[PDB]
């Protein structure tokens, strides 16, 4: 019992709602394997030494993702971007979980919709495989895109409407389930590992073992082994694999460092990184592989190209997997367990980011950790209202702009800034000191070369390509109009740009001269005596040349 615990609470830190949705239209979307390829080089060469720093951060320092920039302090600006991105992240995370709970809740019947046509919000053009002999005309697909989002109610991002009733009520249960969830402290958060360590990985086997044995498995398997350089020479793979592995690992919104706040001293950081990674290498690849299998069986279904037989966007495992569930002996049964694992995956993500979010807000004010009530009220309302805004008719346009833009870039230059901050300033040397302290041995030099150089490198790289190789932003045949983009690239800057702002106002607050105030700024605060001294580290090379 004691070991299958330890190993149910290591998988569940792995397992996502991320891995389970994003994964799915993101490999989709690039092809296939071509996606593989840079997702899993990445993967090690950032996600992992960015995981496991983060943990040891959090849990060394035993602060908030804020307050935990007392080492350095010019950074809680970063910390304060990693909050926002959080927020915007739950956001629309609680838009989804809210659509899994109103898919749900119509699963409970014995003749599903999303088996043929013929129901209200079928539209005339809607066809049949089976009642006769594009992919906006699917079964499946018409009634995701109309007797849940409404979208036929919708010119584009410019004519959202008014909030969907059924959907607002449904997103309303799941805010009230996560503030009553939230609303104590971070114990109750830690009896919801079991439902969701053993039910994805139970329905990611079944349903690729039942995909395998599908008429049209081997084309889709096919195209998924099949690798195209030509696009992995557009840096728009890069991109989505770099976002993809940082929302599925956790680590860039400050969730890691909340969580280990509150983990024991001599607990084991490296090895959590190491199965955790590995577990998130595999369950990704087996989610490709069902996909692609379960959409190759479509296409020989729907007898068109394998290029589009399903949107490329938000909600493609919406529109596959009750396909596949369609198929199975019992379908009703297979249905409603596999959302309501949708529903646990949603529940554990939400509450992790919210959590992070309280516990980074709290720590900078003791006022607020004194209410904590309060303060998660006020912030799950918050969150609510803005999600409420992405319910509209037209909101899967508001969903898609903020998934391209709250992420993504934002992220990227926050764990950048996150890493050139940790190892650069505060010396790696004194990184791997502490992380021998807690735990009883120094980091391989591996580890440290990953921190240091290869990972900032890597991640400068990727935020260049993506600030000067960027395209319109589009969902599926729409195109948004130019205001969007801008109001997109005004949200990503919304949370890059405190960076600058806390170094400037950092700078300006403090007292002293110009050396004097730098120094104040670079050291630790509790080493602060050591500034009339006139003995800084960081302003001797041999600082700066440790490896
Ligand atoms: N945008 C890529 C497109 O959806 C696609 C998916 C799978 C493929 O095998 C392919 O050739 C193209
Ligand atoms: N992978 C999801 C990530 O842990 C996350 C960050 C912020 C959030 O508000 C959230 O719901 C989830």
């Known amino acids: 019992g004691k070991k299958i615990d330890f190993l149910l609470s290591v998988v569940g830190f792995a397992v996502d709602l991320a891995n389970v949705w994003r994964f799915p239209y993101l490999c989709y979307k690039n092809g296939g394997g071509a996606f593989l390829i840079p997702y899993t080089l990445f993967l090690i060469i950032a996600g992992m030494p960015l995981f496991y720093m983060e943990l040891a951060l959090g849990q060394y320092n035993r602060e908030g993702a804020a307050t935990v920039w007392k080492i350095c302090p010019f950074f809680k600006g970063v910390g304060y971007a990693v909050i926002l991105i959080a927020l915007y992240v739950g956001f629309y995370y609680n838009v989804i979980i809210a659509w899994s709970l109103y898919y749900l809740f119509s699963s409970f019947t014995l003749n599903l919709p999303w088996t043929d046509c013929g129901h209200t919000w079928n539209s005339p053009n809607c066809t049949d495989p089976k009642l006769l002999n594009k992919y906006k005309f699917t079964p499946a697909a018409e009634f995701y895109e109309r007797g849940v989002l409404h979208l036929h109610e919708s010119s584009g991002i410019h004519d959202i409407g008014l909030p969907q009733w059924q959907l607002l009520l449904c997103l309303m249960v799941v805010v009230i389930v996560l503030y009553f969830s939230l609303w104590k402290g971070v114990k109750t958060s830690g009896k919801v590992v079991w439902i ?188 609510f209202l803005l999600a409420l805004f992405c319910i509209t008719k037209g909101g899967i346009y508001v969903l898609t702009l903020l998934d391209t833009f709250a992420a993504g870039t934002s992220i990227l230059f926050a764990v950048l800034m996150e890493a050139i901050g940790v190892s650069w300033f505060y010396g790696v040397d004194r990184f791997s000191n502490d992380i021998q302290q807690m735990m009883g041995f120094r980091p391989g030099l591996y580890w440290r070369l990953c921190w240091k150089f290869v990972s900032p490198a890597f991640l400068l790289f990727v935020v260049v390509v993506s600030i000067i190789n960027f395209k319109p932003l589009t969902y599926d045949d729409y195109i948004f109009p130019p205001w969007a983009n801008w109001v997109g690239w005004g949200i990503a800057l919304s949370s890059m740009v405190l960076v600058p702002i806390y170094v400037i106002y950092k700078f300006l607050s403090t007292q002293g001269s110009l050396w004097e105030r730098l120094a104040y700024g670079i050291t630790p605060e509790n080493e602060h005596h050591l500034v009339a001294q006139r003995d800084i580290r960081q302003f001797q090379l041999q600082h700066w040349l440790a490896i």
């Open 196 to 383: 969701t360590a053993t039910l994805p990985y139970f329905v990611l086997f079944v349903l690729l073992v039942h995909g395998v044995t599908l008429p049209g498995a081997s084309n889709g398997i096919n195209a998924y082994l099949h690798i195209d350089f030509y696009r992995l020479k557009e840096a728009t793979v890069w991109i989505d694999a770099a976002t993809q592995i940082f929302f599925s690992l956790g680590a860039g919104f400050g969730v890691l460092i909340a969580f280990a706040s509150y983990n024991k001293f001599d607990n084991n950081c490296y090895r959590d990184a190491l199965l955790t990674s590995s577990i998130n290498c595999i369950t990704s690849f087996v989610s490709g592989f069902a996909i692609f299998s379960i959409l190759g069986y479509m296409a020989h279904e729907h007898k068109v190209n394998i290029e589009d037989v399903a949107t490329e966007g938000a909600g493609l495992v919406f529109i596959l997997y009750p396909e596949a569930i369609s198929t199975l002996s019992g379908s009703t049964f297979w249905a409603v367990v596999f959302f309501v694992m949708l529903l646990a995956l949603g529940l554990d993500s939400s509450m992790g980011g919210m959590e992070a979010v309280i516990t980074g807000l709290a720590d900078d004010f003791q006022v607020l950790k004194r209410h904590r009530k309060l303060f998660t009220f006020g912030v799950t309302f918050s969150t």
